[PDB]
Subunit: 399 residues, 2 copies
Amino acid sequence: HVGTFENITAAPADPILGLADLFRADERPGKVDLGVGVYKDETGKTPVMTSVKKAEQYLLENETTKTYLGLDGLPEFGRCTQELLFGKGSALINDKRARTAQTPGGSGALRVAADFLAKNTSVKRVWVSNPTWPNHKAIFNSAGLEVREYAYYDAENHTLDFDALINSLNEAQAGDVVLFHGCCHNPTGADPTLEQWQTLAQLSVEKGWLPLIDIAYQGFGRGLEEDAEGLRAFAAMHKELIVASSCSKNFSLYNERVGACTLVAADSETVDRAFGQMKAAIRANYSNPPAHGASVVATILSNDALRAIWEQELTDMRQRIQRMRQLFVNTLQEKGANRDFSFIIKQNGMFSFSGLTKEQVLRLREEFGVYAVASGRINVAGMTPDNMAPLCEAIVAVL
Amino acid sequence: HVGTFENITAAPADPILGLADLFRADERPGKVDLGVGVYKDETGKTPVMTSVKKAEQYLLENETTKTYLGLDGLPEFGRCTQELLFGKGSALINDKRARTAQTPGGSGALRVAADFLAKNTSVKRVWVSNPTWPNHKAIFNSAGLEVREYAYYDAENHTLDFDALINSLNEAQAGDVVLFHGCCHNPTGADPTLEQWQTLAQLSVEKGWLPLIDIAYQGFGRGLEEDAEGLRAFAAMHKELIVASSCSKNFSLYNERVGACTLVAADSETVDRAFGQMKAAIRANYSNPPAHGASVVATILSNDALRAIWEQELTDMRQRIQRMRQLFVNTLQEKGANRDFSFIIKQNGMFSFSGLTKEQVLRLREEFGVYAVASGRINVAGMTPDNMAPLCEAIVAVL
């Protein structure tokens, strides 16, 4: 009997990995890593937040059991997530129109949402932005959902081509899902404005598709509250919603897998009914969500002192990012970049498309030991006041 | 436009949640919980293990980042897992034929295996024992895999009906999956003997199906190495295996979601092709596994002093279960039970089928505040020296 695994065809090599091998094997001093997918401080590190440490000490000292919680995870985390997302006093919360399941990251939430949709609804297709987060397609496809792209980023001109977005979405029908990045679009950093969000909200009500809000960077853009404005415009308008939230980035809890899938429906009865089917989706997957990270978040958010410390820590991260964006533009100018990079200061979060070609990226690695990804995505958190000059000089030189 | 969530049909009520809810509402002081699915100590609690508290203190003091690890999680965890499962200095490990992905629980490991199989192999059908752990069917069905049942437990006579097992498995073809519980079969507690495992192993070789060992109770049965004997009997023989292991129970880390999916192929190169595809299944799901629990386990297993502390508390738990099995059997006789229950002491782990009807289970609950699952499954860890008398008096009353 031939093996079950015998004829499996190797998965394509992960370029996210090939590049990271190169970098580690590169012995040149002053190599610059703009390819990384996480936040890094001015020293090139991704530390545990102080607020997070304090909470972990609190859990060490006080937790008395690791016994399972329900499939929807820690209730307090569900409440905190909801208030962060919709704002305290939200009519969604008061009207009990929203149910939240803690999940293993925003990723888990996306997959839970997809399994739930494919299994219980007529949804057959999900619209995502071009470009979008690389993992979106595979998550939805795996649940049997087709993924379509809508127009978003004008790459030659470094803009959110809003007119093209709108027009391309006319092909989306009632009953499709349309996925929108809550804030700090990944990888472009180009976000709708408040009014564009309001327009999008209004169109979704008119067209009848289901919005899904992927919000993984709340607090990395303009501020905690400001970064949710777009979601809340959707909440005021469309009576059904799915939100996949994440604490990986805004709590630097990446590997603890802290996120949430929130269903919103027209009334309590409908959302509760939907939610029982969501539990079934979770039960058929990994069942209970991991407690540690979520308890950390709930401990922090439930406590005023701890909450203050976390918000300042998050603000610091947000402001360093904005500082590097500004410095990048100014230093390219100073070093004589033969074109304008001002778009960089109009974008939010860690990631922008540098607008470099794959040839330029190649040369930047080989010749200057500056590492970006093939798409030209750069992570501005990879920048520091100390590596900026040689970084920008390298870029100027390949233009 | 009509909602997308409007016509979702309600999920069936969850009997496990339902029982848990009824028990919580029961204000009767002598109520007894033999329904829960977790270990409990002589005081009725499910404490965090001393070894785990120590390892969590260590992580608190040492950890300096929470950045993503690979899709297979923490390498030390994978190594400790493989050694626990196959034996240090295993030819499997030596030949580099095994690859381990840390997963969110054995549940996550079962789902990952299922998606992996559906997407990359000719596998259409998974065979499980009647009876089995309740979530098996949901998990494999969600991946589009048909679940079929094979013969296992003789309920009237309280035995593993091994001739029934073998004959019903004749229906299982090459490239089917057949799932076995490694040890402490849930819910019967009736395990194959070594020679039965060897026979089973020889049969799967002859017929050509793919063995999946769900092993969640290593160390709860006869001891760590003894409970792994069945798995090693399969490993010694079959060129391919899948193992879905869990630490929820043997470390009392239930809600941290610590487990693994281990693939085993004929050679390194082949298991590598298989495992990369598995990584793609994980990437389409929750991506990275949750760190905290796997780190705790890696820290404990990798330190001689902590491991000994862990093995001790686990021995305490295994031994407490066996004592309750014995005391239960003995107190039933002394209270006048109208039939013999000595099959109980022969069976392994927290769970046995009591043989009580749903009529009896029901009366037990309502009249005596004694909770068991409708199938009559009982959790002996729900027993103590203090509650044993009222408990056995209740059972005798409904016999």
